[PDB]
């Protein structure tokens, strides 16, 4: 039994407890690749807004300021980030801008099949924000009308319009040829029309296996109009305006 | 967290961030083998053998166990 103990212990140590975390064995080096890009091609004072789980790693490898870390002394702050990721892009933009955030980082495992992606941690963010602000983020709206957590063509309108969803599935269907892509952690089909355009954020980096995706807040319009209007202008195909009708705008101060 | 060790359902009720971290969850029987093979059956015995011959050191070990 003692010799069996030696053998069992060595096998257990080799198989399960000796795996590194920064590099998934295949090597998949997406984490370090994205963090190094952030370290080399971003301003030294820039701030990165991601989930708490990946705070320490960023500070160690990206060497950039972080809103939240693995140590969780303040829970309202983490709730703020969770609200910033479970709400429509306008609200997210306003909240993140109010905290001088430059970049947003998301983890996506749809291609490889990571399983530790943000979409497999979204229901927790919605919970934590729900605690602080019970009237704005409601967990019962990220489900279908039947109670199902779907990321398919049968997702809730609130799901499809959240920041995390629209920022993780961007340009995904156009990857898999034919005009329809297939996820590999949730096993559902995403079509090019299931993903609305992002009008407040730019993509600046996407790792090689599409595991880390880094977006950058775009500066507000010089003309002082909502970025959704700039978008709906740059998209809507040129056509004659409907008519000239007196605008309902109120009273000028 | 120490109260949570007695009121097992307490974490989810109030602190929602303690019940999201995988580290603070119960364990199924297989894990007490995968980690201490052979020793896990032989430990409950050693505790009884130390109990038949109580000494102050043994009282310590028993409480610890």
């Amino acid at each position: 039994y003692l010799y069996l103990f030696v053998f069992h212990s060595t096998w257990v140590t080799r198989t399960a407890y000796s795996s590194p975390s920064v590099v998934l064995p295949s090597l998949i080096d997406d984490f370090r690749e994205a963090y190094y890009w952030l370290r080399m091609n971003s301003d030294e004072d820039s701030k990165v807004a991601a989930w708490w789980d990946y705070g320490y790693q960023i500070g160690g490898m990206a060497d950039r300021t972080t809103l939240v870390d693995n140590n969780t002394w303040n829970n309202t702050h983490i709730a703020i980030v969770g609200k910033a990721m479970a709400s429509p892009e306008e609200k997210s933009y306003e909240i993140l801008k109010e905290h001088d955030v430059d970049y947003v980082l998301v983890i996506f495992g749809g291609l490889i099949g990571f399983g530790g992606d943000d979409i497999n941690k979204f229901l927790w963010m919605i919970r934590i924000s729900e605690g602080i602000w019970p009237e704005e983020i409601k967990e019962r709206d990220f489900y279908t009308a039947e109670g199902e957590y779907r990321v398919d063509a049968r997702a809730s309108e609130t799901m499809r319009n959240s920041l995390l969803y629209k920022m993780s599935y961007k340009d995904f269907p156009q990857l898999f040829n034919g005009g329809q892509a297939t996820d590999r952690v949730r096993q559902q089909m995403i079509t090019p029309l299931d993903v609305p355009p992002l009008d407040y954020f730019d993509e600046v980096f996407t790792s090689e296996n599409w595991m880390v995706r880094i977006y950058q807040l775009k500066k507000d319009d010089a003309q002082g109009r909502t970025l959704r209007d700039v978008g709906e202008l740059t998209r809507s195909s040129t056509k004659t305006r409907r008519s000239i009708k007196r605008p309902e705008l109120g009273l000028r101060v | 967290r120490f109260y949570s060790l007695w009121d097992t359902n307490y974490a989810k009720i109030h602190i929602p961030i303690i019940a999201s971290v995988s580290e603070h969850q119960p364990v199924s029987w297989p894990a007490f083998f995968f980690d201490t093979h052979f020793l896990i059956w032989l430990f409950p015995a050693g505790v009884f053998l130390l109990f038949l011959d109580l000494k102050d050191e043994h009282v310590f070990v028993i409480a610890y166990s």
Binding site: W51, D53, N70, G116, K121 | S20, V21, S22
Partner: peptide, 6 residues
């Protein structure tokens, strides 16, 4: 097992 969300 690590300090991360499940």
């Amino acid at each position: 097992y690590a300090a991360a969300t499940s």
